Amino acid sequence: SKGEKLFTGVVPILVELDGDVNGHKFSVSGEGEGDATYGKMSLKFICTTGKLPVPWPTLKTTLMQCFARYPDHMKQHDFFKSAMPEGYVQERTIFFKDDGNYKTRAEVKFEGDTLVNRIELKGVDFKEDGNILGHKLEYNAISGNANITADKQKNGIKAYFTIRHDVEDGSVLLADHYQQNTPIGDGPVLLPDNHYLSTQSKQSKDPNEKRDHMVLLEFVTAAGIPL
């Protein structure tokens, strides 16, 4: 793939999410720029249906691993860019410990020069009085590793990781992520050796924005293969 060639400069990003958590329907739209050369994404997300019925931090992982910086010695392990421009399906289940689960399905592909992430999210079995529907989570940076492995049989990848969400009482809400990505196209893709993506995030508010929103500055770096 000259999949990788589509990411050498700054790429416009569009995100669309339709969600239903315990029957509470909502939509999010996002925009920004990705600069994979520096593993960088600069984003702003809007709840387009009024108030988000779940905390922003619970949606971060759902709301474009194609923008990761793969060091030169690891470029042969970059499935995500290899599937472009036709794109990939990203499916997850996220199990929130002692609470509900999200099931997500996304299509990540180019529409002309724009990288588009279209997402549907279904959440079930949440506690109306719990840390999620009760909005008891810190609005603070998420960082850490996404472990990537080949899925030869599906010509794709699997991923797993646990996110540790800070709770306002000082406890941690564990969110166990199970991920499967498959190419949309039937052209060849790169099936990687085991590695991980290391994400560093800064999250903020726009003081002039009245809509429920989230501003993100993300840096994502492939790692786990030496040299």
Author numbering: 2 to 64, 68 to 231
Quote the original article:
Recently, a fluorescent protein based on an anionic tryptophan (Trp) was developed and was named WasCFP. WasCFP was further improved to enhance its stability across a broad range of pH levels and temperatures, incorporating 13 additional mutations. This improved variant, which exhibits strong green fluorescence under physiological conditions, has been named NowGFP. Spectrally, NowGFP exhibits green fluorescence (λex/λem = 493/502 nm) at physiological and higher pH levels, contrasting with cyan fluorescence (λex/λem = 429/475 nm) under acidic conditions (pH < 6).
Comparison between the lower resolution orthorhombic crystal structure obtained at pH 6.0 (1.8 Å) and the monoclinic structure revealed nearly identical results to the higher pH (pH 9.0) counterpart. In the case of the Orth(A) and Mono structures, the key residue Lys61 has ∼80% k1 conformation and ∼20% k2 conformation under a high-pH condition (pH 9.0). This shifts to ∼50% k1 conformation and ∼50% k2 conformation as the pH decreases to 6.0, and finally to ∼20% k1 conformation and ∼80% k2 conformation under an acidic pH condition (pH 4.8). It appears that strong hydrogen bonding between the Trp66 indole and the k1 conformation of Lys61 is responsible for the high occupancies of the k1 conformation in the Orth(B) structure. Significantly, this new conformational state of NowGFP captured in the orthorhombic crystal packing exhibits a different functional behaviour: the key residue Lys61, which is known for its pH-dependent shift from the k1 to the k2 conformation, appears to be locked in the k1 configuration regardless of pH conditions.
